[PDB]
Amino acid sequence: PPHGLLDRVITNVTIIVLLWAVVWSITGSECLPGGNLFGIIILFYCAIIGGKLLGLIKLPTLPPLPSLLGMLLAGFLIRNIPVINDNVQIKHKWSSSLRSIALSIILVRAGLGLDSKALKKLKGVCVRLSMGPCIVEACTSALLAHYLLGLPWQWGFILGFVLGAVSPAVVVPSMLLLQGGGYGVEKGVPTLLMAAGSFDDILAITGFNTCLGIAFSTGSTVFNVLRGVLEVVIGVATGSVLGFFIQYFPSRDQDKLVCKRTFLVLGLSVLAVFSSVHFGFPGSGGLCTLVMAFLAGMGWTSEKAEVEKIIAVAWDIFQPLLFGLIGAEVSIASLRPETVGLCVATVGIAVLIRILTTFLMVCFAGFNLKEKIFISFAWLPKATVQAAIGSVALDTARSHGEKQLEDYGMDVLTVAFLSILITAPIGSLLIGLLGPRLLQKVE
């Protein structure tokens, strides 16, 4: 009977073909070239295959390249090869929804994986790490843009803020892997990085929104600033109430305890994210999910392990979708060689300054030199916020009908895409490498 590599490959290809055929039979034209579901399925498969292929290649001393690069390249190729792009189209609504769901899953994972005892003893450190680097990188990015790119100050700051938020989708999985091996959980480095990861897109989005309002002279800056404070407050409050709720009611006496708990956390996080977006407070959803998951994990001292295992499986399913869609958002039109050199220079210098500032922001936290270096190099990744708000400035400029503002929006979009491309894979690789070396393993 068949066995070995041939059996595995035949089973996998049959499963892929069968999934597509089932979807086509149920739906019909929607799962044929030019259809939404066909595009989604093809993007999913291509992202998975690219991740695996990139993981396979390891010629030099360094470990294999991350699957993030494979997924991003798969999406990029699907978008920027005309023949494939014509037959692979995904509605914007579906892409946004899938990316939001992936964000919810990863935020739940991060919240469940935090350590309460460690998080208690590093409070100021987390605040500094979440605030300082973003603001300093935004300021220096605006300074660079005003000179290399010629942008005015308002647009320079729009660029800085849209280039100043790290992606939990890149940081959380790697730090969770490290925490699984106990590689740095003696001072709480994984907890510090996972906690601060989710509070960095409320300072970035708020700054970007207020600067955009100033640039287009629309509305008021006071309300735009206060929106961020309100987002923080309502996120914390909703997360607290929901976490204390699910922490108690699903009780040890119920039969399907694990299934009910996982459904509750996942559904509540997804509902929080989507409803917050709907009601005009985007960013309180992530904080609410983080707080709720953290409190629920505190409630289930050790019974949460199965919940996080199921969520990890869900994340393994959803990561290819997220990163393939992020890659598909970018087009070679933005990355044209007219001025791409200066955009790359600005992104590079901004990243260097961000690393330098992150090193300084953790100086007085009691960490050793190696931990400081690891934290500095584990805080660069930038994937999700940049893709979410990358083209908003250009769209607003287009709506207003101006032409110079369109040029500025084009520069902002180019910078965002370059930052994603040259920061997500390098950051993931650097975390994977420097984890075992610089962090003190525990038993």
Partner: antibody, heavy 121, light 108 residues
């Protein structure tokens, strides 16, 4: 070689509605903007609006708002314009031109051949 | 409302001289003053984008000088296929406004 083909001349009765198409070949259709220009005889050209054939957002000149309805079909590779409640002053040539929306020095580099529209009874 | 005015609607020109089409805007467009050419048969081709940036494939005889709010397009030498109507367009603001057009009649 990139060219755009529009429908032939059409005659319509006043108060009726007319659809005109613009089929683009020789380039990636969804990668550019489709701009509609109306040239009435004697007068100069008049920018009607444009359609982004990637996510279907249309911008219209205030004069032609309501009178024109822009749509596109990626599969068909064509862009359509709707002219409702025609009038004797709506009789003129209509052009479709592409424009690179993500280029800092964009313009309308390639134009259609024109689509004479005559509104009479 | 950036309505663009071309002073001359029909300028006579010989077959070996330098012609200059002048276009002025009712506002301050920085440099977004694309030039178009329409031949008598009804074909319109882009000539010069962004004031002076000659478009690909256009003969070198066309030079889109001029800046501020008073632009001009020049022909180094006049060829028989140059006889057409020339429009100056501005995309500085939202409503893209074309010029009145200029007709090149051969002097005799």
């Amino acid at each position: 070689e990139v060219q755009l083909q529009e429908s032939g001349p059409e005659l319509v009765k006043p108060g009726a509605s007319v659809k005109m198409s613009c089929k683009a070949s020789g380039y990636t259709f969804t990668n550019y903007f489709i701009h509609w220009v109306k040239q009435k005889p004697g007068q100069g050209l008049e920018w009607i609006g444009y359609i982004n054939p990637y996510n279907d957002i249309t911008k219209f000149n205030e004069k032609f708002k309501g009178k024109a309805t822009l749509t596109s079909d990626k599969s068909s590779r064509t862009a359509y314009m709707e002219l409702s409640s025609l009038t004797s002053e709506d009789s003129a040539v209509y052009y479709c031109a592409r424009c690179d929306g993500y280029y800092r020095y964009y313009a309308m580099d390639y134009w259609g051949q024109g689509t004479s529209v005559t509104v009479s009874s | 409302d950036i309505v663009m005015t071309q002073t001359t609607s029909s300028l006579s020109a010989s077959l070996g001289d330098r012609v200059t089409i002048s276009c002025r805007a009712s506002q301050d467009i920085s440099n977004y003053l694309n030039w178009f050419q329409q031949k008598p048969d009804g074909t319109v081709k882009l000539l010069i984008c962004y004031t002076s940036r000659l478009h690909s494939g256009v003969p070198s005889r066309f030079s889109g000088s001029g800046s501020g709010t008073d632009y001009s397009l020049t022909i180094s030498n006049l060829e028989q296929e140059d006889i057409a109507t020339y429009f100056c367009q501005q995309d500085s603001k939202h409503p893209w406004t074309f010029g009145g057009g200029t007709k090149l009649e051969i002097k005799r």
